[PDB]
Amino acid sequence: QPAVELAVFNLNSVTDVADLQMIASQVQLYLQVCGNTTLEQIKSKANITTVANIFALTGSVLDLMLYATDKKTGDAAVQRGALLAANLIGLFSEPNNEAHARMALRPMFGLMAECLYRENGKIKETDIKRLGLHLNAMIAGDLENFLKETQAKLSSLLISATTLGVTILQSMATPAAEKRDPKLKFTNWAVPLIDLLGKPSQANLTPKIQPNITSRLQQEATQAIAALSQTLQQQANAGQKYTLAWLLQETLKAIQALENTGEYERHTKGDTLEFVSLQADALNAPPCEGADSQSGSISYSIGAERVQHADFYLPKIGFSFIRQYNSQMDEFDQSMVGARWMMPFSNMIQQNAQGYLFIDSKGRKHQLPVSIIFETYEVPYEGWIIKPLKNGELILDFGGEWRSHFQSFDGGKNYYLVKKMNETSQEEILLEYLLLDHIAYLKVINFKLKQAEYELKFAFNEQVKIIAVFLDDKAEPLARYEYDTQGNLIKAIDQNGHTRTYEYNQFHQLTRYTDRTGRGQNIRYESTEAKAKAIEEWADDGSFHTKLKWHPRLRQVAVYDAYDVPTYYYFDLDGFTYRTRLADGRESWYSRDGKKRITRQIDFDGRETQQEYNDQDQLVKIVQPNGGIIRFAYNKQGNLVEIKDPEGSIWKREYDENRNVSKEINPLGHITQYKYNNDNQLVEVIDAKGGVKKIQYNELGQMISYTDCSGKSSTWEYDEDGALTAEQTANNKVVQYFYSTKGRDKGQLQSIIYPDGLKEYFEHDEEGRLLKHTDTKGLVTEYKYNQVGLLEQRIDANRHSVAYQWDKQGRIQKLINQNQAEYLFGYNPYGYLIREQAFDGEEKHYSYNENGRLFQIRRPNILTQFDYYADGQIASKSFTHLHTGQKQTEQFDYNLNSQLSRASNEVSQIDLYRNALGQLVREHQHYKIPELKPLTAVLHYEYDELGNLIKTIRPDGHTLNHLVYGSGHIYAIGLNNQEVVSFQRDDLHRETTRLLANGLMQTKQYNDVGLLSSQFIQPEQETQDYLQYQAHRKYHYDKNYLLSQVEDSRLGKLNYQYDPIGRLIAAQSLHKTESFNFDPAGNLIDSESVLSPAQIKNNLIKSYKGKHYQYDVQGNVTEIIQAGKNLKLTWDNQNRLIRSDNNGLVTEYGYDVFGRRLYKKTAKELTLFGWDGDLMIWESFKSAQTNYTKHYIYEPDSFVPLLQAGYKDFIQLIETPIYKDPVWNRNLGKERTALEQFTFYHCDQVGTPQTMTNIRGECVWEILQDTWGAVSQIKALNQDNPFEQNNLRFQGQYYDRETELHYNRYRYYEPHSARYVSKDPIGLEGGMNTSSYVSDPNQWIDPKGL
């Protein structure tokens, strides 16, 4: 720990002078203890002239005091002298012209000391940002120049500081205010301290530094004055560490290293810094409940253990019996609900020596003057008023329409909320008080609310302690309580019977308390005093063990985690946490204006989000971390009408009489009108096209119906209590929800009944954790939870457990899959993940930069490295090869909305353009294929009123129209202003029919559960001239809603089987009977071969059914050897296939930034690819003999293909040079290369093309795919016709004519083993098995390769 520590803050954030009071009191105590003289006695002979910097004056005086009394040596002496000099320099007057410069430099020195004195401390870039802000806020100079001139002028400052210190010490060695104005001078230095001490700060002023029970005194002052010259003259020695010269030198070095109208208004706001070495105890906790203001809950500001426990809920009125504990609530020691326990409506106003003490419902004291009974008053920083009445009843206006009346029953000593009111809702809670021995005891709560009426009768024992909370006339108590002989609430049984047990020591302090499941949360307090702070708390098993240590001098707490990793929080006098210094040194900050509203938040990683409010106290400028200014505007009624996002796109609004938004004119002008019911709820919303959606609510306010824009109403039903008992679909299908009435999970969702009669059953514990889920088929998925409550095991229907392990902080430590392969996670002493064993021994090491963002991922082969922007959006990635050294870099650019705007890599650059609303309107894709003249493919998007996509002009000028019906339902897909399919939809807006342009008529019929039940395709009109396509697929599902049979007309009956989890383990049919063997993790196994392992432990299969695989050190397949085939895959640093050598026929692949293959070169043949997002819209082929382009048209918002139209030429794309190129040539695309051949797809239930038909309706192409995508036989009428051939496969895939690998977007899917040839780019975010494709290909897709 540094010998001397400080609290650097802003002048605006502090209104009281409590810290100044503490410093003055400490000085007075030192004077009394040493010189035996009060400040008044020494005031006379204290005529010394100094600048009117009260902060610097107090700091210097306090500094001088410690130096004279408390002697220090070593580095501690150097630091103390440095801080004394820093406080002095901003204190002496002459020269007057430099007073502002010196008083600005003093907080600079304070900040550099606070940030450099720490062991392994440095000037982070945020430090330089803060220094620049503080400097510029006052003189508006340059940080480098100011620091340099200070360094050159340091000697004069130190000389004048020595003179000032000599003068100050020449006031005591010999035996006998509130304005920080540079131009004002203190005639006497003692006078401001005396004036401070007189101020009624209302903050405890007990000195926190004890003198040494010694003597010396004047001897001490003589020694101090003698050594002042020695300690200050040597301060300038930059060679000496931890000195003003060293601070300036280090700050300059950091600045040099890191260099490679409304602003002025906020400068007047007071972002100027200010630091003190002594601070007063926080008055109380802040209203904030964030992780920075209270632990997982000891509030840091006061160290009070408060636990808010809800006993029962009255759903029809929205009342939860929140019992609030506060180990510092000595006023509620005799509280009827339990000692130091607060129930709802127990807040009251007590009488003390100071005056009236109000204890809000949250448990936060608010001392009020004795004049509240005679006049109105308002507590600062909250915004609620107290007003009296002639009848002695005090009304609290907490903010809103609620007025709470308080009455006194004993000489105006205790004011108990007799009842409340609500001129608005016309409601009002009535509290009936039983009086005994002049002690008012709450007896009945009358909830005379229009929602419902209740009589919360209470029952007391001999001690007058609530033992049961009844309702109206119910025999069952909503809440039962038990108290030990000391009056402590040692057990609180809620309405469901789930007891909570509380353990107290002999002083009403809660040491341990168990949740409803029996899991304790132990606590220990520094002492048995009522106000003693909680200093330690750990779950019963030791997890989450946290040690709080409050700094003796400052308003700081060192919150040690389970591994003694401190996190030093600093809080204001009101408890607001204005700083958070992590163990690694990253400091988060929070500025606050006089009203304690945040105006600047420098996060740990440097992100800064400011909040400039208007004269009406409304945030009218939220500058983002990226520099985007969002200027809100408000109308005369104080309503947010006009919002202006960073790009200038203005969201207008208009409000009705009830301050509800009745209009919403987005930037493009698509007005969205709402309507509300008298209860201030959305009853009806009108879109921009006129579509009207009607919403209905019941007496409770729970939505009970939603009439879609097309007159389709789905009704939600609720019992009297308000628990959802059914939700009916637009076609009258009821999903009835059933809740438990007894057991551990009483009152929770016990089961769900589905429209086909199948019942899901659940099981929870008392705290809501799922313990056992039974699926519709009866398969049980038991979950096991460890002592701390975190999931520790999940036993699925096969009895295969994914055992998790968590370290003492609740972070995942080791994850064990079904194969007993351990996925070790490693965390550095600072608590960041810095390792990952990936089930295969592949250790990924994570590095972090000074901003704490991920900096490198050192995989065994590739060393990823990230470069970020000021906002933290990645600016580039650098995948260096640790062995070969080849480096691949991607570069990103973002607009002011934080949306990707230009992504580039070696072989592409994608420029994304967006309209005011933020939707993609243009997408220029600058291909950079090697050996090929660079060319640009230009996508366009035209949108309708409701933001749907209605027209996309593909690069070669071909336009795909989506003619939309209503609120986004497609009734036809055009193609060059020529229809290619027209849909017909049912009540639920499900497609029940589509008329293809080739005269075919595909009707889909869905069963009760909405699963596809049949699919017939046939011509609208039949002709004997030719054999038009005609086939059908009737799908039958088993109890688990897994496709268990298909009555296909072409393939016959396809019967499937599944294992309990849901993995497909067989698929029999006439064509081929198949069987699959998955290990517990999910890897296909070669069961037929005995020597093959029974489980692929590392998830990387080395052999499966005649294919032997060879993986590199990153888990990607680098070779696949079988009978007569030797495929070698070359993976780039992004783990992407950039070359394939199949029996010597080398291929070459290339990808844009997003992993979308842009080409595939095979000797002279080149297959360009084009994407409009995640979908391969077109592909173009270049070769000596065959040139063609295919345009794949997919169904709306899906990867299922619809038709492919092409022309016998290479695609016509915008040759790279911009604004002139696309628009002119895109109109040259309006001339267009006419699509020669159309061909329509016909997929199965999951979107896999099963056949194809030309424009005349005939079948032209059939594929018999194996279950896992492997092509078994293709029946094409014209093999050579490239437009009658299909390379599409499982939804989102593409067959490769050279490798037989299906190219998913991000990975290559190798159908033989039904697993990707490389590990998932997103690691475990995709699943436990990172190489497996899917469990069930009949209903799961994985279209993007993740």
Numbering used by the authors: 14 to 189, 204 to 287, 298 to 333, 335 to 1255, 1267 to 1395
Would you copy out the relevant sentences from the publication that reported this structure?
The type VI secretion system (T6SS) is a molecular machine utilised by many Gram-negative bacteria to deliver antibacterial toxins into adjacent cells. Here we present the structure of Tse15, a T6SS Rhs effector from the nosocomial pathogen Acinetobacter baumannii. Tse15 forms a triple layered β-cocoon Rhs domain with an N-terminal α-helical clade domain and an unfolded C-terminal toxin domain inside the Rhs cage. Tse15 is cleaved into three domains, through independent auto-cleavage events involving aspartyl protease activity for toxin self-cleavage and a nucleophilic glutamic acid for N-terminal clade cleavage.
